[PDB]
């Protein structure tokens, strides 16, 4: 067995940050375990994590590809002429370019390990033998051959999450986001199941790359997609996906899937409705990846919903064992996992406690058009504060009247504590929204007030200047009650 | 003769804000004077101002159209196929769409005047008869017939600026940005004269719409374009314009222009080099429009360079006469002019003095790719502060390695006071830059430190998140001198 200050199980976003920082900033001896060195089947995730291999990085490339469908059409309003009937979207090329880009990242990460002293990679499946020993095996099977036994002063659990699949008849005919990344050809008809960001993101990707006579359908078991997001924006994204040819089935959920004779899938819904598609993609949730770690050997406690139970400092109930990222089933974001890994390492090896702030985190949805958001939505804020103000701007930007995409209304909302003007949340929908919101996150850290926004001089002409052009609330909540104007008193 | 609380000469960015505020917020009687009711020849600007008619608004629509040249090309990396030889950029269509959009704004300003009590528009040329009378005439000639005599308690000068044309033989064969907006056809060969934002922005526009066998040349009298901007950005923009097929002639300046027998232009540079082009667009500066105001009648004082001299509250040497916007030859931006207009009105009619902060104003250049900037460049900071740190990131984002535009390095630079970490300037080059910098403007009003950026959680994947990923200075200025590391002293 080999001895290490820190052993990390999972070479993903959080795991690599922790490992890199411990080794290069604190001079510790670090071991990092992952199940394969490059993306794709059989394990999908790999060295670099979910985000690099089957997540943020590849899907952003694919969304960027999808945006060209809109660009090509929209150029005509600006005088661009070309043979429309010659236009074809080559999925095979997209996927091949994506694969090369992901592989290049895989390769650079193994170059990092090769070049970095005291930071070593171990290929295999990690699990807990005792509270000081990580065993590395050939496969996920607990009975597979032992490759390595790693003695660890500290153990970090960073194995992320995995797609949830519903227990319905014909689930074997369905796929998840994992497989979506490797489809040999683009589906003519596809059902995306779920109303969260993965389902909305992929619907837009499939919508652009669909062969002729194609149809993308997204279904969601409740009334309105994208729960947790601003309600205006939820309603507007629904309208804007619809206007780009995507069918949105709300209050619907698959009961059953079967094969048609030609090989296509026949979906039956709980309500009795039916749909024939070429691909059914489940995006109904991601669950912490705890099953292979043999946590019962050491008694690391889990949450009711299956995450590793931690405190604010990422500590489990076992003293030298920690958990960060998706395995904790909190905020499933890459930069949050990274921030968590860095704080952990500062605490443990730097001996100066640091915890990640999980509030006021800026995030994005790469829908078409995209969402950018930071902080509280108005419903949540109205429950915590007696007086809240909402500043709303919503209209089609000029260039989209010219482009023909008149449906692309840009939404900008600011939610404040109206007692002192403190900005509680900012919510954006439209082109550039993810890029705009980043520095907004810095503003909220500094406890910006609405006056800090409107007293800042705009950049003209942009969409972002709308954030600096709102002085009078559109409406209020007074102890939970929505109203246009404050009572005369 | 008509009596008014406020008479505004010039119905542009600053004038309209001031007029609207005085009428609607303070209930004053206001007159606003402009020379045209809609955009275009002979006087180009009109109701709405330079920005609405021959500036920011149409310019941005035209750059947006220009971006499609890149989009169509870059789509191929993501699998998009089409008949490339069928591609045509219809300049006439762009201009027609631009015109309708501008005209729509012209028309809406007329409804504003009609619906608003005590806010009236007068068509004609405004000038000062005396301290308390603005005279409106048919033309700029002070001998032309009087249309109106407006008795004014207060007078606001807001006539903006006008293109500078060098005194060279054959200047009559050259145009400015004004005429560029109305060219009947797109020029095959064009020379844009100047290294500032207008010359660069139009170079990009003409480059996208040029007919077959076209060439855009930009010339600049000194060594490196875009003086006043970040040095890394100046160098990068030069590289990236060149890579998109624009010729940049540095250390060259037109000495004369003559008309060829085919109507094209023969340019001779001070060096003796020559170049044949179809259009010569002068973009060597903009100078305050003071001549037609007959300021000598009242003795309003001008600065050495020709602007109306004002204090920080926009007051002239004459108590009831004020000046804002480009006529003051300070910061020539629409939102600054607007902010000055609002502050002046609060001061004069609210009797609570307010002034515009001309520091840390965010701004953009809509080059391809675009620049976004706020605050000080490092050479300027190194003079005001004893120790400054520069945080720098410059690389081609993944998508542009796939797109084929490998020359598109995104540049992010933060300049700080290294004594306390206070952010002094932020400078960006690349897609989204103008949108990213807006909320950065808010951050600098809040006196953000570098640590406020790097302790903010990133939105991934974005270009903007680079701003939150820089912890270690790339280099420093100590007592005005550049060095990679701080001295041990
Ligand atoms: C389709 C999709 C799109 C997404 N888009 C975004 C986005 O746009 N922005 C964003 O911020 N986030 C996005 N995410 C979420 C983001 O990918 C995760 O939040 C982040 O990757 C979690 O990081 P982590 O360190 O917790 O784990 P991961 O990055 O998932 O890394 C866990 C690693 O552990 C390995 N592993 C698992 N079991 C073992 C074992 N027992 N032994 C050894 N190794 C093991 C896995 O192979 C994996 O590489 C997306 C996710 C998906 C699925
Ligand atoms: C090509 C170009 C691109 C630009 N791009 C941007 C940009 O992207 N972002 C930005 O912030 N700024 C931009 N600007 C600058 C911006 O347009 C100006 O800073 C702004 O319009 C100035 O506002 P103003 O109120 O001072 O004057 P203006 O908006 O120019 O208004 C002055 C008005 O007064 C009228 N007038 C003149 N003389 C008389 C007279 N004697 N009697 C009656 N009326 C008169 C004129 O017709 C004009 O309408 C651009 C300018 C140009 C030329
Ligand atoms: O971001 P999320 O991970 O919550 O995305 C999952 C999406 O699928 C929905 N969903 C969650 N569980 C199920 C289920 N078991 N069956 C069908 N749909 C589900 C969620 O709806 P919801 O948020 O309404 O639970 C959400 O819209
Ligand atoms: O103007 P400014 O405010 O500096 O920047 P602007 O944004 O107005 O751009 C004007 C450009 O033209 C150049 N220029 C100014 N005067 C002349 C001249 N008379 N002949 C040729 N080129 C000229 C400037 O060079 P420069 O950077 O040297 O001022 C600058 O690059």
Author numbering:
A (entry chain A), B (entry chain B): 2 to 490
What's written in the study?
Large crystals (approximately 0.8 mm × 0.3 mm × 0.05 mm) diffracting to 2.3 Å were obtained in drops containing 2.0 μl of protein solution plus 1.0 μl reservoir solution, where the reservoir consisted of 0.1 M bis-Tris propane pH 8.0, 5% PEG 400, 2 M ammonium sulphate. Diffraction data was solved by molecular replacement using the TcTryR structure; the overall statistics of the final TbTryR model are given in Table 4. TbTryR is a homodimer and each subunit of the final model comprises 489 amino acid residues, 1 FAD, 1 NADPH, 4 glycerol and 1 sulphate molecules. Also present are 786 solvent positions that were modelled as oxygen atoms and 1 PEG400 molecule (associated with subunit A). The first residue and the last 2 residues in both subunits were excluded from the structure as there was no convincing electron density to model. The same applies to the nicotinamide moieties of the two NADPH molecules, which were not included in the final model. The overall structure of TbTryR is nearly identical to that of TcTryR (rmsd = 0.6 Å over 482 Cα atoms). All the catalytically important residues (Cys52, Cys57 and His461) and residues interacting with T(S)2, including those involved in binding the spermidine moiety (Leu17, Glu18, Trp21, Met 113, Ser109, Tyr110) are conserved between both structures. Analytical ultracentrifugation indicated 90% of the sample was present at a molecular weight of approximately 93 kDa (data not shown). Both techniques therefore indicated the protein was almost entirely present as a dimer in solution. We have observed no significant differences between the TbTryR and TcTryR in terms of Km, sensitivity to inhibitors or in crystal structure.
T. brucei subspecies, along with all parasites of the order Kinetoplastida, possesses a novel thiol called trypanothione [N1, N8-bis(glutathionyl)spermidine]. Protection of the parasite against oxidative stress is achieved through the oxidation of the dithiol form of trypanothione (T(SH)2) into the disulphide form (T(S)2), followed by regeneration of T(SH)2 by the NADPH-dependent enzyme trypanothione reductase (TryR). However, the enzymes trypanothione reductase and glutathione reductase are highly specific for their respective disulphide substrates such that selective inhibition by small molecules can be readily achieved. Metabolism of trypanothione and other low molecular weight thiols has been established as an attractive target for drug discovery in several trypanosomatids and TryR from T. b. brucei has been specifically validated as a drug target, inter alia, by conditional knockout experiments.
